[PDB]
Amino acid sequence: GSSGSSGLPPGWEQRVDQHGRVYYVDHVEKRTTWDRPSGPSSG
């Protein structure tokens, strides 16, 4: 909500697709997600 912190935790990467949807890549978990690893998930 406010400007203070911005980035990702230790072990997660930051990449983007050809569509323009930012997604992180875990090098320890080997998973791809457009949103942070924490939060609600849509089935």
Curated annotation (Swiss-Prot):
On T-cell activation, phosphorylation by the JNK cascade on serine and threonine residues surrounding the PRR domain accelerates the ubiquitination and degradation of JUN and JUNB. The increased ITCH catalytic activity due to phosphorylation by JNK1 may occur due to a conformational change disrupting the interaction between the PRR/WW motifs domain and the HECT domain and, thus exposing the HECT domain. Phosphorylation by FYN reduces interaction with JUNB and negatively controls JUN ubiquitination and degradation. Widely expressed. Residues 8-37 form the WW domain. It is found in: Cell membrane; Cytoplasm; Nucleus; Early endosome membrane. It is linked to Autoimmune disease, multisystem, with facial dysmorphism: A disorder characterized by organomegaly, failure to thrive, developmental delay, dysmorphic features and autoimmune inflammatory cell infiltration of the lungs, liver and gut. Acts as an Acts as an E3 ubiquitin-protein ligase which accepts ubiquitin from an E2 ubiquitin-conjugating enzyme in the form of a thioester and then directly transfers the ubiquitin to targeted substrates. Catalyzes 'Lys-29'-, 'Lys-48'- and 'Lys-63'-linked ubiquitin conjugation. Involved in the control of inflammatory signaling pathways. Essential component of a ubiquitin-editing protein complex, comprising also TNFAIP3, TAX1BP1 and RNF11, that ensures the transient nature of inflammatory signaling pathways. Promotes the association of the complex after TNF stimulation. Monomer. Part of a ternary complex composed of SMAD3, ITCH/AIP4 and NEDD9/HEF1; within the complex NEDD9/HEF1 interacts (via N-terminus) with ITCH/AIP4 (via WW domains); the complex mediates ubiquitination and proteasomal degradation of NEDD9/HEF1. Interacts (via WW domains) with OCNL. Interacts (via WW domains) with NOTCH1. Interacts (via WW domains) with JUN. Interacts with JUNB; the interaction promotes ITCH-mediated ubiquitination and degradation of JUNB. The WW domains mediate interaction with PPxY motif-containing proteins. The WW domain 4 mediates interaction with ENTREP1. This is E3 ubiquitin-protein ligase Itchy homolog.
